[PDB]
Structures are given as structure tokens and as C-alpha cells.
Amino acid sequence: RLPARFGVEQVRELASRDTRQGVGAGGIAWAISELDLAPVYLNFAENSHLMVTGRRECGRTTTLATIMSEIGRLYAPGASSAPPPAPGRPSAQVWLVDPRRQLLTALGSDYVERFAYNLDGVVAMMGELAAALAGREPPPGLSAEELLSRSWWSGPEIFLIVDDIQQLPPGFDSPLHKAVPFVNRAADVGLHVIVTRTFGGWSSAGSDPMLRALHQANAPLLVMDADPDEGFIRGKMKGGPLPRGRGLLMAEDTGVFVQVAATEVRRLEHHH
Ligand SMILES: Nc1ncnc2c1ncn2[C@@H]1O[C@H](COP(=O)(O)OP(=O)(O)OP(=O)(O)O)[C@@H](O)[C@H]1O
Ligand SMILES: [Mg+2]
């Protein structure tokens, strides 16, 4: 069964030798499964997003750091000042909400288009992001012949990565409300929303429009070390105590235990 630590260098060894179908192979490799000790991916063919939750120091930030490292491996740099990508390569652009500033250097400025650490910064950044996403569709009222001619928007894959979403205001106040309309058609606008939240008060966190939209889109939910007392999370599954880095990867009614690939974060600040 699963080890207490499995490095990202280790999962990459496995990913380069994995040709399994229907698991998102060739994509972001961020964990290994309890079932077969094989890689677990962000299967963008199934879903564009990911939610991660768990109690204090379960490994939420490290999970994002591993995913970001994978983005750097699999994608050409897609920030505005980055060079044109090598032929055949997809491009990735990161929009980072990181209040505790732990993920600022997981990727260089050739990947990170915008990052925000204060509320005003988040509000401003989300406005810019929404404007870019709104442009990713054809002009209205074109003929069939016109629509056939080309792809009408161009640009890199956009990763909206948010650590510690619990620190943001909930409700309609939420700065993330401008990105909500794109969640359901994320694949068509090349959007990926990856968010973490502390497990405390999880069932009462539906009040966040982004978390609600992600649940409505049936995004994968990794429930790391957690408390059964919060009740059922998805279907008949409750959260439970787990070693650090380990989580129950939930769909709607089913789940599988995984061990998240570890990577270094110089930056870890827990406010002890
Ligand atoms: N995948 C992992 N495998 C093994 N250990 C891990 C893993 N992820 C995190 N840890 C360990 O757990 C500790 C906390 O890491 P991290 O800061 O990522 O957690 P966190 O949940 O974000 O914490 P916080 O609650 O402060 O946000 C660190 O010591 C880290 O080494
Ligand atoms: Mg953290």
C-alpha cells in the first residue's frame, strides 16, 4: 500500500512509462493510487478542474506546488512576455491567488501572468481574467462559412490557481464571481480552476459561488486528512483521518485513496 512519501521525481518516472487509457495519461501527474500504485492525473478529458480540502497542514499547498511543477514540465511558458512556443507544444498561463505567498516561485514569470496576495489585487486580477475569458468565443451572428474559416480565439491554457480560498469573502462579494460563468464551459475557453480550502466549516462553504459552481460541474474533490463530524461530503462518503499527503479522491458517489506527489516548497508558512 501507499508510502508516507512519494516524490514528484518518482511519479515522473512512472508517468513516462504509463500508456493506460482513460486516466489522463500524458497529463499532469500529481499522485499515485492505493489500488495499483500507478500515477493519478488531472484528467482534463473528464473534468477541467480540481478541488482540494483537508485539516491544517494536510498538504494543500504542496499539492498545488506539485501541480504547478507539472505545468512547467508539460507546457511551454504562456505568460504574455514569454517567447513563442516550440512547434507542437501546448502553452500554459497561470493566474495565482496566493495570500500567504508560498507559491510565488513554483513557476517563473514566464508562466505566471498575474498573481495576487491582497484583496484589491485579487479583485483587479479577476477583472482582467474575466475580460480575457469573455473574448474566447467567435463574434456573434457569423455565417457557417465564416465560422468554418478559422479558430476565432487564440492563446495559452489558463490555470486559475487559488490557495486558501477560505480567506476570501463569500457570497456575491466574492472576488471570484466574474470567473464563475466560465466554469461550466471551461474546456471551450481553455480554463482550469484549481482551488484549496481548509476543511473546517466545509459543509457551510457552499456559500462560495466558485465552490458551488465547481460542485455543479462535478469537479474532482480530494478530501485529505479530515473529520467525519462534518457529515457526508459527496454521496455516502465522509471525510476521515489520513497521513499527510494522502487523500480520498472523490467523484460523486465513488472515491479512491491516493498519495499526493511531494515537492519542495521553500515557502511554507503555517503561522504557528
Ligand atoms: N504529499 C506530501 N507528502 C508528504 N508530506 C507532505 C505532503 N504534502 C505536505 N506534506 C507535509 O506536510 C506539511 C505541510 O505542508 P503544506 O504546507 O503543504 O500543507 P498545508 O495544508 O497547505 O498547510 P496549511 O494548513 O498551513 O495551509 C509539510 O511538512 C509537508 O512536508
Ligand atoms: Mg497551505
Residue numbers in the entry: 1125 to 1396
From the paper:
To explain structure-function differences amongst EccC-ATPase3 domains, the crystal structures of Mtb ATPase3 from ESX-2, -3, -5 were determined at 2.20 Å, 1.97 Å and 2.00 Å resolution, respectively. Though the sequence identities are only 20%~30% amongst the four ATPase3 domains, their atomic structures can be superimposed and have r.m.s.d. values in the range 0.99~2.02 Å by comparing Cɑ atom pairs. The second is the loop connecting ɑ1 and β4 (V2), which is extremely long in EccC5-ATPase3. Here, our structural data showed that the recognition pocket in each EccC-ATPase3 is different. The signal binding pocket of MtEccC3-ATPase3 is much wider than MtEccCb1-ATPase3; the pocket of MtEccC5-ATPase3 is much flatter while MtEccC2-ATPase3 has a shallow recognition pocket. Thus, a hexameric model for EccCb1-ATPase3 can be proposed based on the hexamer structure of FtsK ATPase domain through superposition. Indeed, this is similar to what we observed in the packing of our EccC5-ATPase3 crystal structure which has six-fold screw axis symmetry. Similar to FtsK, the protruding segment between ɑ2 and β5 interacts with the loop between β4 and ɑ2 of the neighboring subunit. Such an interaction mode can also be observed in the helical packing of EccC5-ATPase3.
